[PDB]
Design an enzyme around this catalytic site. Structure first.
Site, PDB file in Angstrom:
ATOM      1  N   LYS A  55      11.885   9.830  -6.602  1.00 14.37           N
ATOM      2  CA  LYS A  55      10.819  10.926  -5.715  1.00 14.37           C
ATOM      3  C   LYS A  55      12.255  11.791  -4.705  1.00 14.37           C
ATOM      4  O   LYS A  55      12.491  11.179  -4.397  1.00 14.37           O
ATOM      5  CB  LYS A  55       9.883  10.754  -5.352  1.00 14.37           C
ATOM      6  CG  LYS A  55       8.841  10.880  -7.067  1.00 14.37           C
ATOM      7  CD  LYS A  55       7.120  10.577  -6.058  1.00 14.37           C
ATOM      8  CE  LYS A  55       6.277   9.761  -6.792  1.00 14.37           C
ATOM      9  NZ  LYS A  55       5.416   9.904  -6.617  1.00 14.37           N
ATOM     10  N   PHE A  77       5.847  18.081  -4.711  1.00  7.32           N
ATOM     11  CA  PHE A  77       6.346  17.313  -3.981  1.00  7.32           C
ATOM     12  C   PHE A  77       7.715  17.732  -4.028  1.00  7.32           C
ATOM     13  O   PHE A  77       9.019  17.581  -3.696  1.00  7.32           O
ATOM     14  CB  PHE A  77       6.230  15.872  -4.223  1.00  7.32           C
ATOM     15  CG  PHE A  77       7.084  15.375  -5.201  1.00  7.32           C
ATOM     16  CD1 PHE A  77       8.175  14.598  -6.341  1.00  7.32           C
ATOM     17  CD2 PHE A  77       5.939  14.840  -6.235  1.00  7.32           C
ATOM     18  CE1 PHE A  77       8.593  13.862  -7.472  1.00  7.32           C
ATOM     19  CE2 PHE A  77       5.800  14.706  -7.341  1.00  7.32           C
ATOM     20  CZ  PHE A  77       7.289  14.103  -7.752  1.00  7.32           C
ATOM     21  N   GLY A  78       8.237  17.614  -5.664  1.00  6.63           N
ATOM     22  CA  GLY A  78       9.416  18.558  -6.091  1.00  6.63           C
ATOM     23  C   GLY A  78       9.722  18.038  -7.278  1.00  6.63           C
ATOM     24  O   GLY A  78       9.454  17.514  -8.313  1.00  6.63           O
ATOM     25  N   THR A  79      10.680  17.043  -7.335  1.00  3.05           N
ATOM     26  CA  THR A  79      11.727  16.601  -8.626  1.00  3.05           C
ATOM     27  C   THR A  79      11.541  14.452  -8.242  1.00  3.05           C
ATOM     28  O   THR A  79      11.725  14.491  -7.569  1.00  3.05           O
ATOM     29  CB  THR A  79      12.827  16.717  -8.861  1.00  3.05           C
ATOM     30  OG1 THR A  79      12.819  18.929  -9.372  1.00  3.05           O
ATOM     31  CG2 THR A  79      13.398  17.097 -10.630  1.00  3.05           C
ATOM     32  N   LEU A 100      13.755  13.390 -14.896  1.00  4.36           N
ATOM     33  CA  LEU A 100      12.552  12.667 -15.107  1.00  4.36           C
ATOM     34  C   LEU A 100      11.224  13.121 -15.571  1.00  4.36           C
ATOM     35  O   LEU A 100      10.580  12.864 -16.288  1.00  4.36           O
ATOM     36  CB  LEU A 100      12.241  11.006 -14.879  1.00  4.36           C
ATOM     37  CG  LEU A 100      13.598  10.290 -14.329  1.00  4.36           C
ATOM     38  CD1 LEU A 100      12.897   9.076 -13.750  1.00  4.36           C
ATOM     39  CD2 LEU A 100      13.764   9.668 -16.047  1.00  4.36           C
ATOM     40  N   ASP A 102      -6.096   8.601  -8.046  1.00  5.78           N
ATOM     41  CA  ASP A 102      -5.127   9.351  -9.224  1.00  5.78           C
ATOM     42  C   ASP A 102      -4.828   8.653 -10.835  1.00  5.78           C
ATOM     43  O   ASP A 102      -3.946   8.323 -11.120  1.00  5.78           O
ATOM     44  CB  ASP A 102      -3.883  10.309  -8.671  1.00  5.78           C
ATOM     45  CG  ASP A 102      -3.031  11.067  -9.309  1.00  5.78           C
ATOM     46  OD1 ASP A 102      -4.126  11.918 -10.178  1.00  5.78           O
ATOM     47  OD2 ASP A 102      -2.869  11.761  -9.301  1.00  5.78           O
ATOM     48  N   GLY A 146       6.562  17.274  -9.931  1.00  9.43           N
ATOM     49  CA  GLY A 146       5.063  17.541  -8.295  1.00  9.43           C
ATOM     50  C   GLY A 146       5.638  18.327  -7.638  1.00  9.43           C
ATOM     51  O   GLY A 146       6.312  18.754  -7.279  1.00  9.43           O
TER      52      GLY A 146
END
Ligand code: R6D
Length: 258
Positions: free
Chosen positions: A40, A20-22, A15, A127, A18
């Protein structure tokens, strides 16, 4: 709050992504029915950061905030949330230019209610942007991405950092101070993004160039077709002096009556 990896099934398409990863779509086998989820998936301080995000989401319970299902520690750390099928608001509007402004007002008002709850809860989002508003349907928006959020101390109304510059109020850039009023300024930029059908704000400008412009009292212009009352509210959200800028109670109240 700890999920069973065997009960989670992930799809290969992603989807989003970031630092952080996927983010992947998945399915979690609940009590009987199976629930569609967005997950996440962690790629060194990111684990602690992901756990901090989960800690905030665990404490929040509001219809306009994405709900977390839980955390799962398997091949990687995972943050499992309820799925908002239509995705980020900015991308949706870039692809659906025929949503009625009235429909946009409904969505931005929903965002103010989630933010009113967050302010009442003494959490700062830090954010808030159209990319972090997710659509469950075209008439139901939920706030997401609590990775930067902070629980304010009982005795202070701001968090001081020791960045998405275009969404940050002047006091964040100059003094590193983040409050619910700072989130109000972001909400004004988010409003501008929504009424511009997902265009990026301050197109082509560096962060330092944005800061100089705001210090001069200049603000982004009215997007094409945006109703005057909503542009007026945006300008109110972009009040330079944190003390005279409205809070979410005032923003939400104005949006509700309109
Ligand atoms: N931090 C990040 C980064 N990225 C995503 C997310 C994210 C978090 N969440 C929590 C609940 N729900 C979601 C969600 N939901 C979503 C739903 C649909 C899409 N789209 C994928 C692309 N798609 C085109 C390809 O086929 C048509 C349009 C729909 C994207 C995200 N996302 N969080």
């Amino acid at each position: 709050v700890y999920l069973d990896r065997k009960l989670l099934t992930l799809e290969d398409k992603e989807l989003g992504s970031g630092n952080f990863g996927t983010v992947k779509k998945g399915y979690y086998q609940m009590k009987k029915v199976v629930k569609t989820v967005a997950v996440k998936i962690l790629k060194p301080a990111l684990k602690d950061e992901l756990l901090a995000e989960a800690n905030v989401m665990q404490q929040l319970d509001n219809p306009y905030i994405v709900r977390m299902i839980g955390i799962c520690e398997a091949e990687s750390w995972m943050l499992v949330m309820e799925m908002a099928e239509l995705g980020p608001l900015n991308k949706y509007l870039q692809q659906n230019r025929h949503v009625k402004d009235k429909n946009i007002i409904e969505l931005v008002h929903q965002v103010s209610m989630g933010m009113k709850y967050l302010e009442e809860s003494n959490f700062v989002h830090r954010d808030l942007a159209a990319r972090n508003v997710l659509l469950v349907t075209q008439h139901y928006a939920k706030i997401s991405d609590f990775g930067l959020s902070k629980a304010l101390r009982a005795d202070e109304n701001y968090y001081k950092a020791q960045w998405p510059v275009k969404w940050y109020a002047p006091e964040c850039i100059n003094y590193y101070k983040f409050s619910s009023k700072s989130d109000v300024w972001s909400f004004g930029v988010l409003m501008w993004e929504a009424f511009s059908y997902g265009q990026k704000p301050y197109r082509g400008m560096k962060g330092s160039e944005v800061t100089a412009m705001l210090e001069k009292g200049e603000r982004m212009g009215c997007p094409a077709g945006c109703p005057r009352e909503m542009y007026d509210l945006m300008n109110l959200c972009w009040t330079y002096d944190v003390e005279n800028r409205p809070g979410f109670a005032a923003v939400e109240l104005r949006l509700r009556n309109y």
